[PDB]
């Protein structure tokens, strides 16, 4: 249930900043900086899985 709550909250967070969604949604091969970005966003904010 908290998975659902946090996932819809971070969905609100994505629709709140469109530019970061554009950036993390690049169809590129070496996507690793992207993943850093996302954890940089909620490193200590949400659950690990």
């Amino acid at each position: 249930t908290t998975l659902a709550g946090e996932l819809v909250s971070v969905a609100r967070l994505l629709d709140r900043e469109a530019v970061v969604t554009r950036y993390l949604t690049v169809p590129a091969e070496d996507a690793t900086p992207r993943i850093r970005l996302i954890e940089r966003l909620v490193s200590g904010k949400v659950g690990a899985p």
Partner: protein
């Protein structure tokens, strides 16, 4: 919830984080579009 307006730092670093290869996405009539290559 929303962070303390540090999002720009995140993205600006994502950009500052930039052997490079791109991929053709479109082609026709002698004109192509290339995704990738952040430093051309």
């Amino acid at each position: 919830t929303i962070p303390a307006d540090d999002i720009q730092s995140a993205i600006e670093e994502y950009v500052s984080s930039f052997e490079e290869v791109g991929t053709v996405v479109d082609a026709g009539d002698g004109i192509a579009h290339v995704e990738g290559l952040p430093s051309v």
